[PDB]
Design a protein around this ligand. Sequence first.
Ligand SMILES: [Mg+2]
Ligand SMILES: [Mg+2]
Ligand SMILES: [Mg+2]
Ligand SMILES: [Mg+2]
Ligand SMILES: [Mg+2]
Ligand SMILES: [Mg+2]
Ligand SMILES: [Mg+2]
Ligand SMILES: [Mg+2]
Ligand SMILES: [Mg+2]
Ligand SMILES: [Mg+2]
Ligand SMILES: [Mg+2]
Ligand SMILES: [Mg+2]
Ligand SMILES: [Mg+2]
Ligand SMILES: [Mg+2]
Ligand SMILES: [Mg+2]
Ligand SMILES: [Mg+2]
Ligand SMILES: [Mg+2]
Ligand SMILES: [Mg+2]
Ligand SMILES: [Mg+2]
Ligand SMILES: [Mg+2]
Ligand SMILES: [Mg+2]
Ligand SMILES: [Mg+2]
Ligand SMILES: [Mg+2]
Ligand SMILES: [Mg+2]
Ligand SMILES: [Mg+2]
Ligand SMILES: [Mg+2]
Ligand SMILES: [Mg+2]
Ligand SMILES: [Mg+2]
Ligand SMILES: [Mg+2]
Ligand SMILES: [Mg+2]
Ligand SMILES: [Mg+2]
Ligand SMILES: [Mg+2]
Lengths: 154, 87, 34, 124, 233, 66
Amino acid sequence: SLVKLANTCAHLQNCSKVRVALTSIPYTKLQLQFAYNLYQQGFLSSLQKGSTMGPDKDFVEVTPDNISTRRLWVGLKYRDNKPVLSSCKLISKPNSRIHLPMEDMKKLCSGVTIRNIKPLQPGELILVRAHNNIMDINEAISKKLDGEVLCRVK
Amino acid sequence: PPVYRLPPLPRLKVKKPIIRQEANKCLVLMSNLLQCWSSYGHMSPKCAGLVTELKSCTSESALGKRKSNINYHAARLYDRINGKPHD
Amino acid sequence: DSVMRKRKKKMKKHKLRKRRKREKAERRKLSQGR
Amino acid sequence: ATLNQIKRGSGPPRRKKISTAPQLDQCPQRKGVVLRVMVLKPKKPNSAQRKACRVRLTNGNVVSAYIPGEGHDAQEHSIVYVRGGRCQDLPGVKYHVIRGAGDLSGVVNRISSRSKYGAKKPSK
Amino acid sequence: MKIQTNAVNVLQRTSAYLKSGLLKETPAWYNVVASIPPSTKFTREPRFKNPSNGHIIGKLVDVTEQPHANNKGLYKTRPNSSDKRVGVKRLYRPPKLTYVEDRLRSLFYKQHPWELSRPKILVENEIGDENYDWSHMLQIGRPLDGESVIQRTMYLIKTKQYGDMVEAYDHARYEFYALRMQEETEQQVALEEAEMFGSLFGVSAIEHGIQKEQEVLDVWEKKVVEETELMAA
Amino acid sequence: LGQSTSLWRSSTQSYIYGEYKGIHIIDLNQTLSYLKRAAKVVEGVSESGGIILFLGTRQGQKRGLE
RNA sequence: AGCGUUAAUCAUAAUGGUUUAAAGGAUCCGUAGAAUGAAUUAUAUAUAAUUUAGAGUUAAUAAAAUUAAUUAAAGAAUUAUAAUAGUAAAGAUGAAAUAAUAAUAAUAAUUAUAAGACUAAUAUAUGUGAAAAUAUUAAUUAAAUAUUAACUGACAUUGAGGGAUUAAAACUAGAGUAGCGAAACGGAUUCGAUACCCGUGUAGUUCUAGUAGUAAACUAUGAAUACAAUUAUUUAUAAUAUAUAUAUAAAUAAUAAAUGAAAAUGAAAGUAUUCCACCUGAAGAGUACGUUAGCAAUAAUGAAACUCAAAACAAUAGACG
RNA sequence: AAUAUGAAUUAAUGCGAAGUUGAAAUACAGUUACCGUAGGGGAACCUGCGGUGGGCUUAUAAAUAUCUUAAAUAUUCUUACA
Ligand SMILES: [Mg+2]
Ligand SMILES: [Mg+2]
Ligand SMILES: [Mg+2]
Ligand SMILES: [Mg+2]
Ligand SMILES: [Mg+2]
Ligand SMILES: [Mg+2]
Ligand SMILES: [Mg+2]
Ligand SMILES: [Mg+2]
Ligand SMILES: [Mg+2]
Ligand SMILES: [Mg+2]
Ligand SMILES: [Mg+2]
Ligand SMILES: [Mg+2]
Ligand SMILES: [Mg+2]
Ligand SMILES: [Mg+2]
Ligand SMILES: [Mg+2]
Ligand SMILES: [Mg+2]
Ligand SMILES: [Mg+2]
Ligand SMILES: [Mg+2]
Ligand SMILES: [Mg+2]
Ligand SMILES: [Mg+2]
Ligand SMILES: [Mg+2]
Ligand SMILES: [Mg+2]
Ligand SMILES: [Mg+2]
Ligand SMILES: [Mg+2]
Ligand SMILES: [Mg+2]
Ligand SMILES: [Mg+2]
Ligand SMILES: [Mg+2]
Ligand SMILES: [Mg+2]
Ligand SMILES: [Mg+2]
Ligand SMILES: [Mg+2]
Ligand SMILES: [Mg+2]
Ligand SMILES: [Mg+2]
């Protein structure tokens, strides 16, 4: 869900503000994907499944017995007295969800304000959902996927 | 027991530090004499030495002999003694 | 509203009340039968 | 300010200018007939004797019009044209009699700013 | 207090100045600070073990990991309320260090109040230099006290001479007692010897105490008389 | 031996090892590494001929500081 | 070869706000919502089958005796009447008088009857209630906390319109009426005194049945969810080997960060998401007209003309009291 | 039926002019001020009832404190001693 995603973004921002190292997130698929995307772009130092109490050392299979207590632990990242993941504003908010075609995404990438989105920035990452798979907006353009403009990290 | 923490104050100070001195000797003698004269009629010689002692005390002046650094410690140690959280 | 600002409002309300008191008989006359 | 609220009528207040001269009826001038011609005391703090006049326009509504320039020529019936200026010190007068036209004559021995009054070019 | 940027970014700020020409000459520290960079990464780092005990902080016991019946014979089939709450503050708040020896220490001084009266120097000598075999109590650099007993108990526990802790403690206590008795006898006999061979002690401990009391009493007496006089009048 | 459990600036959390006797205890391996780093920079500025200034306002510190 | 001026149009700040400046509905309940809202997999934002983390249901085990409504009790005093004995003042105020005060024998005192209305300590409104509210006692009926066990399987959030409750005053009936007390009258005060003080003291305050639906109905701060750095206090829960030092929550008080016009807010006035209400210069105005509702007072709804370049808040330094 | 214009007389309100009567508010504004409401008064206002602080969180003591080798030992010590 999108509300959840917004909440996790807010939590990430809060954690960046006070400089915590290792932070929990809810264990869902969308959320996990988002976390993986951040990790690959280079905003998170670590990403690992775990309990509500802490990250897991060994593998523990997730079932109806565990699922309520399961959690996604995430390492934050800092360099020269400045946090890497400064912001996590989402674009498609729950009330005004926005879905762009490939042309619109291209325009956004090339410095054009679209549907009241400030076009994407030098060291920024706009994530895009396309058939329940979160991608970079550039990646989506390359693959040519009309998708929901999810969120924005800087 | 019930502890009572104050808020952050501008300045911990007592407005009138008492330096509870001892009471005056001459005054005491005078009171004793008065007490003696309550009994034994007006001026009997049971209080013959007491009157003399009083006179000796109150010859140069009516009283014989003529401050606590407490709010120099409060002021000093307020910032320490606070449970004021960090900056 | 500060107290000073409120005082203008209060005054206005008082004036209105006075006007209503004055125009009671007139109001009664106007109301009944029309 | 919620998205739904905005949809059902909410937003910034669009500042659509407002008519400085309503009685003029959305046009540059209107002809009028002077009724009386006054000498008004201005507001505090500035003092003079302002040569205003009362004018019934052709559209019907009556207006307190200022008369600029030195000495003027206006009776109790003169044809006078009104424009939408405002005499700032006199309250309740939101108009000027335009001075070259009508029975109101051009202001005499005017050298500077002649078109602002009636004054013709002296022609050596 | 906000994380100060300007205490650790000193060389960068000076490097900029040098580039500009605001600074003609480089500082003495500049090269040194370049060589040895500051930390500048003021994070809250999480901790997963209590160092004293060796308990695990991070882990959660699952429903599948608790198959057998609970106290009051109910099988756990669900996560409880506490198993759902996100326990992140435990990872970050520093661990309360616990030792088995602390309890033994507490017990000993309850059992032996007058061992508290034996003065204790807390100013450490080289902690690395020592090398005590707790086969016995009497170590060289260390004095005889409840601590030594406790160390002996711990040694016994480790070696499994006494498998039970209580028995080991008792044994250590009994070892201590004999030593204490011996110490007591030593001093008395030394005193006796001194008395025999014409040694002269100017002030004995009890005499000293009496003298100390006397001054206080004298102070009290004058004050008390004054107070009585006050009361009379 | 760190300050106290109730006088805690949580900014310093990474440095502290655990709490004991109602007192935060400073991780001492960390202390060592920071000391070494500090010692090296002190040596470096002395080598370069820099002005080192030792500031110590507490009561007993004067003689050792001098 | 136009330049002025007037009349107009577009641009020129919502890349806004509502504790204190315009602006949170008195409070909750709940309908619509073309408002928003968990998990996993598979179908070609939906369907389908599975989940239990939200939201509920019922037990069990601990606690708590509070809030409603109703019925039945308690108490210090107050006034009034009467008796007793007793003597000249009493009562009041800044100081005085007027009065159902007193030589018809008072006031004070001691008794003895009656009447209403109030609830000293404990008390912190701590707590409890949706908010109005709510502390003498008891009973009845209703509702209420936490943790476990089991079950339901997103059933939720917010909520236009709507609905219900809503202090004090007011009103309509019928009781009641000690004390207090608008008005009125009288005495003072004062240049005056339609006041502040004193005296008589009617409505009212009290109960029963209603009407009405407003208050600085205020935390001047709508509700919900997720999240973020410390400390100290209590409160409850669990374990500990009943009294220890521990783990949880909850509240209260200081703060970090952050936000902020600042004052300051501090788990919200922070970071975010959702939903509703409301604001768009000051006067004129919550006025007029109109409509609806009310026994009525009134309540809600709610304009325009005319006139200004004002008007407002936080804080600063003075002067002043 | 609705709308528009007119109406003797009459009410509110604005702007100007600073006249008269008081002195209600701002300080403890000389009776704390304001909310709701009711009654009264030339006029500001006054008075009852409950509410609010945007007025008092402006908050700041009933006082007494202890014994071990005072030194040939501590106090000195400049990478020494071990
Ligand atoms: Mg306001
Ligand atoms: Mg010219
Ligand atoms: Mg700050
Ligand atoms: Mg615009
Ligand atoms: Mg409200
Ligand atoms: Mg609701
Ligand atoms: Mg509420
Ligand atoms: Mg009470
Ligand atoms: Mg009645
Ligand atoms: Mg009266
Ligand atoms: Mg009533
Ligand atoms: Mg009703
Ligand atoms: Mg009202
Ligand atoms: Mg309000
Ligand atoms: Mg506070
Ligand atoms: Mg902000
Ligand atoms: Mg604000
Ligand atoms: Mg009305
Ligand atoms: Mg008709
Ligand atoms: Mg007329
Ligand atoms: Mg006068
Ligand atoms: Mg007065
Ligand atoms: Mg006063
Ligand atoms: Mg006054
Ligand atoms: Mg006053
Ligand atoms: Mg007054
Ligand atoms: Mg009156
Ligand atoms: Mg009042
Ligand atoms: Mg009340
Ligand atoms: Mg109230
Ligand atoms: Mg005030
Ligand atoms: Mg104040």
